[PDB]
Each structure stands twice: as C-alpha cells, then as structure tokens.
RNA sequence: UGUAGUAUGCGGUCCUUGCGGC
C-alpha cells in the first residue's frame, strides 16, 4: 500500500529543497523558479505537455529533437531566467522519466527515455497519462515552492 | 483627474509604423515611450549620473511593473492622411536613376490630438513638459533624427499651468533653461530628491546638450527633400542640408560624413548607438528653420569613445547659430 | 494530507497552508507554532501492542529523537496529526 | 530560410505543417493557434515559438493577418447560429442590450500564460475574440470606485478614518518602511473605497444615502452594492459576455497584429543606463482592430431599474475607463 | 417536497436524476467543432431507456436504441462527413489523428434517438443539420477529452491601490465548454401530500405541468451566475 | 444490459489491503449545501459531506426461503420450489431504489436473479 | 428516513518607441 502521493510529495520536497540550498543567495532565481512553477500547469493545459517542454528548451537556447534532460546542467546558465527554466525542465522531465527512483514506489511512466522524444512517437493515451502525472507533480512542486522559496 | 489636450500638426511626413511595416499610422504606445525617453533626457540635468533616482521618479510618474501608470495617454481624433514620401537620407541603388526611396508615411499637417489624463497636478505637469520638449526638440517615428518627425503644437488646452509657446529664436533659446528649472523645482518640492551634482550624464540628457538653428524658408513645400538627384540645382532646405552634410570638405572628420560620432551603423555594420545629432524643423512666426540638437554625453557607447568637438566643426561649416546656450 | 504527510516536510507544508489561509502573516506564523506544539502530544493506537510511544508522549521529552530512532515514525506522526485535527474540529464545533 | 518544427506527436505534425503552409484548410482558430503551435528557427540557433518568430513563415505581416482572418471567417455560419441563440438567451431574461464599436484597439486576456507569451481571449468552439462578463463587471466596479474617489474622496476619508489608518499601516507593512509617509492621494481613497465595498460592506450603511452622477442618471452607493453584491449578499445584475456581431466579420477583419518594441529594456529590468546602445526586442501580439462592433447585455434578478443603472455605468466605463489590456494607452475604448 | 422547515409531513412527488453527459464539444480541424460520444455513454443511455421502459411498463420504447453495438480501437472513430478530412480518411479532434471507421447504422440510430427525445429542433438549430458533426470515439479518448478539453478560466482581482493584481488575487476555475449536452431523468409518482387539488390529482397532471413549464427554458447552473456563467437551455421530452 | 465478454478485459484482482483501501477511500464524497433565496448565499451550518457507493458496482445477496407457513396456501405455491421460482420470476431484471436520497436520483439498482 | 444548489464577493491586470544607420 504505497500511494504515489507520498512519492510525489517526497520528490517535490527534494527538488525544491535542492534549488533552495543551491541558490539560497540568488533570491531572483528562487522567484523566477516559483513563478515558472506556478505558471507551467496553465501552459501545459493550453498548448500540451510537449509544447511546454519545447518552450522550456527554447528558453534554454537549446535545440529540440537532439537534447535530453540527462545532458543539461541547470547551473551552467548565466541568466536567472535560464537557470529557473533549466531547473524546472530538469525536475519535470526527471519525474516523468524516472520518478522518485528505481527502488521507489513510482519509477516514472517512461522507462528511461527522454519525455519529449517519448511524446514525439507515442500514442495519445500515453501522452495524456504523462500530462496528468506532470500536472500532479507540478501542483506539488508549486505548493512546496510557495512554501519555502521567496516570492519575486 | 486633471487632463490636458494637445492638437499637433505634422510639419514633415512622419514614418510611424505598427506591426505591419508597409502601413504607417500613429501609435499611442510609441508616443508614450518617446515621452518616457524625453522625460529622462530633461530629468538627467537634475539627477545627473544618479540613475537610481531618475528610475524611481520615472516609475512613479509613468508607471512600472508594480504600479499602474499615473498618467494615461490616448489619441482621440485623427484628421490625418497617408501618402508616399521619400526617406530622409536613403537613396535607391537603381541603375542610372540613383534616386531616393519613398515609403508610406503620414502626410504633412495631418491634424491629430493627444490627451494626457492624471489624478495629480504634478505628474500631469511633468508629462506635459516631457511632451512639449519632445515636440519642440525631437521627432517621432522612423528616421526622427534626420528631420522626419518635427511637430508643432497647433493648439493646447490644459487645466494645469504650463510653459507658453515661443515667437522668436531667443524664446526657444531660454525655454530649455526655464523647462529645466521648472522640472528641477517640481522634483525638489514633490519627491524631495536631490542626487547632488556629480558630472555629465552617461545617457543623453540636458547636462550636456546644445541646440543650433540654420536656414530660413517661407514655404512648407520648399523644406523637405524634393529632388531625386543630389546634383540637381533645385534643392529644398533639407535637401541642401543633406548635400552639405554629404560634402567631404564640410567637416574635418577623417572619414567625412562616414565617421563614428554619428549613429553606430556606419562602416562597422554593428551596434545600435543612435546618433546624438538630431535634425528637425522648427516653425517660428511662420518661418521654418532647421533645428539641430546634440547630446554630448560623457561616454558615447560602452567600449567606444569618439571625439565630440569635431561635430561642432560641422556647425562651423554651415554657420548654424547656437540657439542654446 | 493525513494519509500522505511525512515528518520531514510537515512544517513547510503546514506553513504553506497557514500562509495561504491567513489574511495576516502573523496569524499564519502563530498557527504554525501552535500546531507544531500541539500535534506533538497525541496518543496513538498502533497496530502493534506498543505503549512506549504513549509513555514518551505523556512525559514530555526528546520524543522527536525517540521517533527518529523509532522505525514506525511515519505512522505515528500521521496518527498524531489526524488526531490533533480531529480534536481541533471537535472543539471548534463545540464553540459554534 | 527558416526551419519549422512541431512538438506535437508524430502523424499530426505533418497535418500541422500542411495547415500552416495553407495546403489544407483549418476551421478552428484556437486549435491551430494553441494545439498546433509551430517552433520557428531563424539564422539564430534557437526555435523561438513566439508570434514574432511565428510570423516569419509567411510572406509578411499582411499575409499572416489575412490567413488568421480567413481561418476565423471559415466558421461564420456556426458563429451566426451561436449568436442567434445568444440573443435568444438575452431576450429570455429582462436583459437590456446595447451595441458599441471599438474606438481604439482592444486586447483582453493578454496576460494569460501561453507558449506565445502573449495570448488573447478567443472563444474555444468558434475562435472569435470576446470579452468575458467578469471583465465587464470588474471594469464597471472599478469605474464606480474611481467616480466615488474623485467625487467623495475627502468625505469618505473623514467618515472612515479608522479604515484609512488601517490601510496606511498595511501599506507601511508591505511597501518598504514608509512609516507614515503614506500620501493621502486619490489612490489611497480608491483603495479604501474598494476595501469598504469588499470586506466592510455593512459599515457602508451610513454612506448608502450618497449619490453620484453618472452620465445623465444618479446612482446611490446602496444601489451599487446591491448591483454587485457582497460576501454575504449576492449581486442583482447579471453581466453577460460580449461577442462581435457576425455580419461585420464578413467584410472587415476581426483580428490584427500589434507590436511592442522595448528599447532600454535592460534599463527597466536590470538597471543599466538608458543611453542608446539598447537594441530593441520586438514582440508581436494579436488584437481586435478598432471599429469592430460588440453586443453587450445586462440582465436583472430583482429590479429592472438596477439593470438600467448597471447598463449606464457599464457604458460610461467602456467610454472612459476602457476594458481589456493596456488601458493606460487608450486601448479597449468604445464609442456610441 | 416540503421546505426545510418541516419534512415529516410528506415526501416529494418528483425525483430528478444526475445530468449524465451525452455529447461533448471538441475542436476539430474541419467541422469547426464536433459533438463527441463514447460507447459507455450510449450504453448508459440504453440503460436509462431500459429504466424508463420498466417504470412506464412500455417495452416498445425499450428496443429503440437496442440495435446499436459498437467497438472502437483507441485510434478509430465514427465521424460525420463534415469532420472527415478531404482527400484523407482521417479526422482531427483537437489533439489526435483518428482513422475514420466505416459505420452508418450507429450514427443514424443515435441521431434518430436524439430526434425522438428532443423533437426536430436541436436547441435553436435543426437536428438534421448536426448529423454530420457527430463522432463516436474510444473510451480512453473520450475520458481524455472530458478531463483536458474543459474550459480553464483565469481570473484576477485588481486592487485600486496600484491597479495591478492583488497579492494572491488570481485563481483558475474549471468550466464545462459551451455547446455541450447533458441528459437527466426526472421520475414522477403519486404525490405524497393529502387533499390535493383536482388539477394536480394524478401523476400525469404533474408530468404535463413540468413539461410545459420547463420546455425551451433558460436556467442557471453552478456558480458565477452574476458574471454570465452556467446559463443553459433546458428542453423537456417524453416517450 | 452489457456483453460479459467486454467486462473480462477490465477485471482486476488486487491484494486484501489494497482492496480495503480502495473500498474505503474510492467512494464518492460529495459536498452539499443549502442556499436561502433571501440572500442568495449558503445557509449557515448548511454544508455537509455525504458518502455514496459508486455506480456500476456489482453486489450479491442471499435469500433463504423455507417451508411456507401452513395457512391454507394455494397449491400453486404450496412447495418451496414454487415460491422460490415465483420470486425469481417476479424479481428478475427488476429496478428498485435502495437507501436514502431517492428524490435526487440516488439508489436505483438493477436486480438479476440467479437462474 | 424525510427536507437541502459548493454558493456569494474578485478586471489576466501592471511594465515596454517598429526601431538604429545609408
């Protein structure tokens, strides 16, 4: 009886604490991350999950169809907006592709494939379930970001 | 809710465009941004290099990302016409012809009004002063700094006391001084900002600004460029000004008119530092003159320094009278 | 959240909820402090026949460290918060 | 010279590219705009999915506007039957209906989050611009607030010195220190008036006898609070959404583009000196052009007189206050 | 039934039912928007018809829909000619390319059932004018449409102190999309009161009164009444 | 009223604890209120949550029939077999309402006697 | 069991020259 809600909460707490600790000095980075987190579900519901991920990648000045989440470093960007976008993309894609971990209750809907490349050549039902999971995890992430992270 | 209305007439064709580049039309947003720039220019004299105070007062007056604008600007009536008009200093590369390039632009005169409304007298006065300074010493739209945006106040109607229009050259001469002193008085009385006085501003401002006048014409149709050939004997006032500017013997610049004290896109094919030289048309007692405004800022552009007094030599080449100071 | 809350992020989650549901930040801080204090002392009815937890709760001690050493901390804290919320609801309905 | 990509699933990107190349005919504007958003890569190595970069796939701005308006016009019959049913719903209640043309450009919903970063309120089924009833109610309430503050500012400030002191203390708490500066300008009066109308409605009982002249009629504070309602009492005037008349969509375009060119953007955001070395960052956004005619309707639940008063207030607000976005620049203004 | 101030006197003579969805408005590439249905939807409609037949002891109407069995893959649909793409046997419903399954009896029977239930006028437009804008999709696809294609409306509160959105003054609301169809059952028995007037003596005198008083009317459902949300056209029908 | 073959594809069997948690927390929790027309808002103290058993739920019951009471019963239902037969015939494919909230379309179930 | 509308109050706003030079 291991509810996925516990995994969602643990992963969201871990990622928000990670960004808080790594960028405790950069208040503007925290504000940008919080704003992007609480605005992402609207973008996903409007234009879809793949469009949202491609929008994040474009804001990262990175090419699409040739970039996965494992090969991006969120801290390797000078701009605060790029920092926050990279962190949000990494967190969302990590939850979608691996979950809280291999040994955890939730291991991610995608086995290990990049969520964008997964969305490119999968059925509508799979991308719908992925969108639902992304909505839930983004809700938890926004909750925790509003909890700890400072507001821009 | 004090409000002011300014009915303005386009002395020269105005190249103001919206999203559709092929269509020219008057935009409230562009005018508001230009008034923001001109208010910065006038307030730089009082605020000097203290950019923080200027930013705070501008956010107080024109609004920022955390407060709605304290002054709202609208364009109410547009008795304007759109036609074709040659570009100020652009020549077509057509074989043999080598004539000008004519874009769609607002026709001369083109009566229209601007309404500025606020809830406080001081901020409305600041906005009105910025707008009148813009109209008198600046242009609007594309190629404003090349005599294509000059506007005269056809009529004014304000419930707040303002500065009267000029009649002669000296009136426009000391209007700079009285506008600056009134702006400083408002800044000191209302917001109590001082910012001391360090040196000349990094941006274009009135700390180091000069105004000159040249030429004299009685017909509006004999001012803007008419001839399609520079060598033609029939040249209007602005055509003669352009011909003198293009002459190598005019100024002492090593590259001539292709120097770097003017706008950045000259030879280097890079940067966007606008030309501190601004050309316009000034009407005084039904007499038209070419007005030249220069903003000799301390730093021309971060990473590039150009000599300043060389441009004054051009003023000596044409013998333009120094209206201010 | 009673069926999902864990010890590590209880304080931050309750802080978020207080800030969201408080007109004043002082009210949210007071609610956070009073909830954190009150939810500590609540007797639990574990599935296993264990009374040491209740003995630790009754006395007032390093009970937090004992739960850190304990292997059923998550169930204990979930039952504690659920019981405290039930007591709060009962008392509020009593008032009104 | 531009590379177009589609982050939608495969076997659908082909149809999206066919729609954007005008090879096929799409009929829903919201569908092509949102669910089939293209990512355009110019010489710069970045797939910017913004209207400024989206328009690069067309010949010019005019072609983009023509394509959008043709897609909008392809559903004219369905929009006509929808508007007929909407008018029938209007007439079902004792609703007063008035038509107003757009004096200037109008844009509602510009702040909505989207891939383009500049959205627009389009009806989901038919893809036509419209004004939500919430926006009309809010603009009417704020016009009433502004009228009350301009007319009865000092009076309400004196009557509610406790409330104005509470608001000043709150502002001091949030807005930096500002211990007692807190200027008693018109904005503070508007804020305390809104606070009275929102959380302190009952204390507004004494003020209810006041009257303010709107247009040609006179409206009481009690009338306004009855119209809009409180946390404990529901409003009595139903504000319906506004939709353009289907007839005008046949001839003149119902959607055009507008540009914002933020020079000195680092000066505004980061703090660099303005100067002129501040190459602009143009951003385009959709907006319904001026002259487009909209139909508004306000219904009553208790008294038709309240409906007439609300109609007059809304007409005055749309004439002066303006609805939509960028109202400080004269956008979203209506004329008789 | 009696008001809240007193309930032991008698019970209500009417019993409304849950407004189960029948057609969902989904955006389409051709046929600007389409009315969508699912096999579970029509199965529940058949169950509702069976319940009506059992209540009225009228088996004749029981088999009206009993001639419609369907089974669709997740990438197949039975759509009208308007929605079908020209030169390509495929349809697009707001996010998905679906191959057009070939079948006519099911859609014809559904149109006939709707016509019998709600007459020849389908809420301001003829019913035959929308028979080519109906799509029957897979169950998961219909669930995804009903969960993700609903209206999401963002609203803010503007404070007069600054003219900007207040601190935490923004919120999102979920709305059923416009032009959607919900069917409900309203069962009626003998009134439970005593000494009834002759005009409402029997159940049919309640049936006709309800039908005449709630035919082609307009009602407000849910919240946001003051801002013009939740307004619905109601049509009452009998078998 | 549905083909049993389609049901086979959507049958799952879970653990005991999982089934208990499902049956405890997957029911329909519906919040209801009462609105007064005088003010148009919810009446004070009128909000409450009611729990409803989900639709499309299969349940089974056992009816134990014994020897009919000796009260000069007709020979048609004289034996136990006859009475169980008549009960099954008269209750097969029936529709009946159980529980409260009958006035709001809650409780209607379909009974299919086991033959 | 019977009677019972998750409803009322809330503006997707605020901030930005279609320019720079021949």
Swiss-Prot record, chain A:
GO cellular component terms given for this protein: cytoplasm
Family membership: Belongs to the CRISPR system Cmr5 family.
Localization, UniProt: Cytoplasm
Functional summary from the UniProt entry: CRISPR (clustered regularly interspaced short palindromic repeat), is an adaptive immune system that provides protection against mobile genetic elements (viruses, transposable elements and conjugative plasmids). CRISPR clusters contain sequences complementary to antecedent mobile elements and target invading nucleic acids. CRISPR clusters are transcribed and processed into CRISPR RNA (crRNA). Part of the Cmr ribonucleoprotein complex.
Keywords: Antiviral defense, Cytoplasm
Pfam families: Cas_Cmr5 (PF09701)
The protein, known as: CRISPR system Cmr subunit Cmr5
Gene Ontology process terms (BP): defense response to virus
NCBIfam families: cas_Cmr5 (TIGR01881)
Transit peptide recorded as keyword: no
Keyword Nucleotide-binding: no
């Amino acid at each position: 009886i291991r509810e996925i809600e516990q995994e969602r909460a643990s992963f969201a707490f871990k990622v928000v604490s990670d960004i808080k600790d790594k960028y405790s000095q950069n208040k503007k980075v925290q504000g940008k991350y919080s704003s992007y987190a609480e605005k992402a579900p609207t973008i996903i519901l409007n234009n879809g999950l793949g469009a949202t991920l491609a929008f994040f990648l474009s804001k990262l000045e990175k090419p699409i169809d040739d970039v996965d989440y494992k090969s991006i470093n969120p801290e390797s960007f000078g701009n605060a907006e790029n920092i926050a976008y990279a962190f949000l993309y990494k967190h969302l894609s990590t939850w979608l592709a691996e979950g809280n971990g291999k040994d955890s209750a939730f291991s991610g809907l995608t086995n290990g494939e990049d969520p964008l490349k997964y969305i490119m050549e999968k059925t509508a039902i799979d991308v719908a379930i992925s969108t639902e999971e992304a909505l839930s995890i983004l809700n938890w992430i926004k909750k925790f970001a509003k909890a700890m992270l400072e507001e821009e | 809710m004090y409000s002011a209305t300014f009915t303005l007439e386009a002395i020269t064709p105005v190249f103001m465009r919206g999203a559709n580049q092929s269509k020219a039309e008057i935009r409230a947003a562009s005018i508001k941004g230009l008034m923001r720039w001109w208010f910065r220019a006038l307030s730089g004299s009082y605020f000097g290099n203290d950019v923080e105070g200027l930013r705070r007062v501008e956010e107080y007056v024109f609004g920022s990302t955390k407060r709605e604008s304290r002054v709202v600007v609208e364009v109410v009536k547009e008795h304007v016409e759109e036609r074709f008009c040659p570009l100020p200093m652009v020549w077509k590369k057509k074989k043999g012809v080598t004539t000008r390039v004519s874009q769609r632009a607002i026709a001369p005169g083109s009566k229209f009004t601007l309404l500025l409304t606020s809830d406080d007298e001081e901020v409305l006065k600041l906005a009105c002063y910025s707008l009148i300074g813009l109209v008198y010493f600046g242009g609007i739209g594309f190629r404003c700094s090349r005599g294509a945006g000059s506007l005269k106040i056809s009529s004014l109607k304000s419930d707040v006391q303002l500065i009267d229009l000029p009649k002669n050259k000296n009136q426009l001469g000391q209007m700079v001084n009285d506008l600056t002193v009134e702006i400083a008085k408002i800044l000191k009385k209302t917001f109590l900002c001082d910012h001391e006085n360090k040196n000349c501003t990094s941006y274009s401002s009135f700390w180091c600004f000069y105004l000159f006048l040249w030429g004299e014409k009685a017909e509006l149709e004999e001012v803007y460029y008419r001839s399609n050939n520079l060598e033609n004997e029939r040249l209007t006032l602005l055509d003669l000004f352009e011909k003198e500017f293009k002459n190598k013997n005019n100024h002492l610049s090593n590259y001539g008119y292709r120097d770097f004290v003017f706008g950045l896109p000259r030879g280097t094919k890079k940067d966007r530092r606008a030309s501190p030289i601004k050309v316009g048309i000034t009407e005084l007692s039904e007499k038209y003159h070419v007005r030249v405004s220069v903003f000799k800022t301390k730093i021309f552009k971060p990473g590039m320094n150009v000599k300043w007094d060389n441009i004054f030599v051009f003023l000596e080449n044409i013998g333009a009278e120094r209206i201010y100071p | 959240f009673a069926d999902v809350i864990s010890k590590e992020f209880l304080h931050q989650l309750v802080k978020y909820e207080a800030v969201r549901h408080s007109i004043d930040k002082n009210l949210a801080e007071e609610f956070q402090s009073v909830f954190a204090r009150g939810h500590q002392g609540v007797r639990v009815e574990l599935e296993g026949n264990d009374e040491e937890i209740n003995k630790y709760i009754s006395d007032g001690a390093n009970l937090e460290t004992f739960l850190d050493k304990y292997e059923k901390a998550v169930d204990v804290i979930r039952k504690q918060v659920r019981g405290f919320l039930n007591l709060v609801k009962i008392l509020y309905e009593s008032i009104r | 010279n531009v590379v177009v990509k589609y982050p939608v699933n495969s076997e659908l990107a082909n149809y999206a590219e066919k729609f954007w190349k005008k090879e096929l005919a799409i009929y829903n504007l919201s569908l092509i705009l949102n669910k089939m958003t293209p990512f355009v890569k110019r010489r710069s190595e970045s797939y910017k999915s913004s209207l400024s970069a989206v328009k690069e796939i067309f010949k010019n701005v005019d072609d983009f506007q023509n394509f959008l308006n043709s897609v909008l016009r392809r559903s004219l019959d369905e929009y006509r039957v929808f508007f007929e049913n909407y008018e029938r719903l209007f007439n079902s209640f004792s609703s007063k209906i008035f038509s107003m043309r757009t004096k200037s450009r109008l844009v509602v919903g510009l702040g909505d989050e989207s891939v383009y970063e500049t959205s627009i309120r389009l009806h989901r089924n038919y893809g036509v611009p419209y004004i939500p009833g919430s926006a009309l109610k809010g603009v009417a309430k704020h016009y009433a607030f502004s009228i009350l503050a301009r007319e009865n500012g000092d009076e309400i400030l004196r009557i509610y010195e406790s409330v104005k002191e509470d608001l000043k203390a709150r502002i001091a708490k949030r807005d930096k220190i500002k211990k007692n500066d807190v200027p008693e300008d018109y904005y503070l009066t508007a804020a305390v008036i809104q606070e009275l109308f929102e959380k302190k409605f009952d204390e507004l009982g004494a003020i209810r006898n006041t009257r303010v002249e709107i247009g040609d009629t006179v409206i009481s504070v009690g009338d306004i609070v009855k119209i809009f309602g409180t946390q404990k009492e529901e409003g009595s005037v139903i504000f319906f959404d506004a939709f353009p008349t289907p007839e005008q969509l046949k001839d003149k375009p119902n959607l055009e583009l507008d540009i914002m060119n933020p020079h000195y953007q680092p000066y505004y955001q980061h703090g660099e000196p303005p100067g002129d070395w501040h190459s602009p960052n143009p951003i385009f956004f959709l907006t319904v052009p001026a002259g487009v005619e909209f139909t508004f309707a306000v219904a009553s639940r208790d008294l038709d007189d309240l409906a007439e008063k609300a109609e007059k207030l809304l007409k005055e607000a749309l004439k002066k206050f303006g609805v939509g976005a960028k109202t400080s620049l004269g956008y979203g203004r209506f004329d008789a | 039934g009696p008001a809240t101030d007193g309930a032991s006197e008698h019970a209500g003579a009417v019993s409304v039912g849950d407004a189960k969805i029948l057609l969902f408005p989904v955006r389409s590439a051709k046929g600007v928007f389409a009315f969508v249905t699912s096999p579970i939807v029509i199965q529940r409609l058949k169950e509702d018809f069976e319940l009506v037949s059992e209540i009225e002891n009228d088996i004749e109407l029981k088999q009206i829909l009993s001639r419609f069995k369907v089974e669709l893959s997740n990438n197949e649909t039975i759509a009208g000619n308007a929605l079908i793409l020209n030169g390509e046997n495929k349809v697009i419903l707001e996010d998905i390319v679906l191959k057009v399954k070939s079948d006519s009896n099911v859609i014809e029977n559904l149109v006939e059932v709707l016509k019998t239930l709600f007459g020849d006028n389908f809420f301001g437009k003829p019913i035959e004018s929308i028979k080519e804008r109906i799509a029957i999709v897979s169950d998961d696809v219909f669930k995804s449409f009903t969960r993700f294609s609903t209206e999401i409306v963002a609203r803010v509160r503007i404070d007069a102190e600054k003219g900007t959105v207040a601190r935490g003054g923004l919120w999102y609301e979920e709305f059923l999309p416009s032009d959607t169809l919900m069917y409900s059952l309203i069962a009626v028995g003998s009134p439970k009161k005593e000494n009834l007037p002759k005009e409402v003596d029997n159940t049919q005198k309640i049936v006709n009164v309800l039908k005449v008083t709630f035919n082609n009317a307009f009602l407000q459902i849910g919240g946001d009444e003051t801002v013009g949300k939740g307004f619905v056209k109601v049509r009452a029908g009998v078998l």
